């Protein structure tokens, strides 16, 4: 897979592992100090049943996108979707927005696929095992600023 | 039979008058036992959880109104009724007869037609007591 | 449901398909080489419609006891029947029959319960709709040798 | 949908006939192209020898029966047809309008349990014409 997709995705759970603590039979997460950028990715925290624990954002589509299937090994998976439904996953002022907009005019039947990424991290004395997904907000089809031409002289 | 019909529709009825859709989600109040069931074949309120007599209840039996049979064994006829039923010493006799015995139970389906109110239900109601013991 | 009746089943209804040949409009099966030990099944072959095309053995009971209804899916099937109609199922040298001996002096009204398979194979340039069923011949309840008897110390 | 399944499972069907096992090793005889698997997801044989084709299929699909897609750019779905095949002429109209056009292709995967005479086949079927030509 592209490499710097699994850095962001895998980066991005391990730290949301390290933020979470479990009190009173429930999750929370700290927002850390120092923290100098917002990142392209939205992290759920799920239980060994399934059962959602914690998510960062509600987007309702995108939640029921995570096939219970994924939850049950450390993998990578896509969760294909349309230009409307991706504008929903980014800030209103996140400058891939005017990308979604350049789509929508180009061809607004046009599918945007997002990375997704499962892992888990066993139970430990003061904490149960917990399954951290990790979407990529900005979708596969955007991620470059052109496209190659095979030019021949 | 006649009168296990008479039994088993009835009761059958008598829930659907209980059944109350409210909230987008049914909602019940109050020797049988009855399920309710939506359109799609999904189990929406039960009147005892019983895993075993959940799956049982064959989901093609759902599509139609019908008279059906549901066969097992002896131990777990016993613990559907009370703990001291009538018809405990009789499934004793049948025990300690062949501890391995079968019973089989015979179950009404019937499906009520949509309505402004409510949608679509389909009611499941299992006779608790067997065709052995009649 | 049963792995063991899954792979009999299927795989001889396969088998069947595979030595079945469509000539003057009309069902024949090669019997072929070096065939080991025989199934203990009987094979129905029926044609879009539901009429009996070629059958292994002509039961009459048994050819009546396959619903109409099941022969429009693939599926999963069980005939409920008695004692003496099963060992109309079986060759009369089959080591079973001794079991059904013992089962006809013990219970008097046994019932024995015979699985069925269904399985469509789709019309091709040389061949229609084929449906193909598979009758177990040796009944559910004479399958194991022992009963486990739950032991507590 | 339901033409297309008729079409890929039947071709799948068609090559289970004409499947042998002997030496402990397999051998087939001869708008489809057909791979067959092994038990572990290994691939023991393929009705041609295009490498992305065999890589897209995702060794998942392999464990059980079911229906995929397999997304691909239109150069590589006009190499997999014959050099003049019918529908060339209209995908070169696709690519003269979008060079790096997308097309999507349905496949279907089937397993066929073991037997005395052959291991258990899992049997790949992919329809080499795109489902935007239909
Ligand atoms: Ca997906
Ligand atoms: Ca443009
Ligand atoms: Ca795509
Ligand atoms: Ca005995
Ligand atoms: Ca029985
Ligand atoms: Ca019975
Ligand atoms: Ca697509």
Do not use: C
Request: aromatic share 8%; hydrophobic share 35%; charged share 25%.
């Amino acid at each position: 897979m592209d490499k710097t997709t699994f850095r962001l995705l895998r980066g991005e759970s391990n730290l949301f592992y390290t933020l979470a603590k479990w009190e009173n039979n429930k999750i929370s997460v700290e927002l850390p100090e120092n923290l100098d950028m917002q990142s392209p990715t939205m992290t759920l925290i799920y239980d060994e049943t399934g059962k959602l624990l914690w998510t960062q954002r509600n987007i309702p589509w995108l939640i029921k996108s995570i096939q219970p299937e994924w939850l049950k090994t450390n993998g990578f998976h896509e969760i294909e979707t349309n230009v409307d439904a991706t504008s929903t996953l980014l800030s209103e002022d996140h400058s891939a927005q005017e990308k979604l907009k350049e789509v929508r005019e180009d061809d607004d039947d046009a599918e945007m696929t997002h990375s997704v990424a499962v892992n888990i991290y066993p139970a430990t004395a003061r904490m149960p095992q917990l399954t951290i997904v990790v979407v990529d907000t900005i979708p596969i089809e955007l991620k470059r600023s052109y496209m190659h031409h095979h030019h021949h002289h």
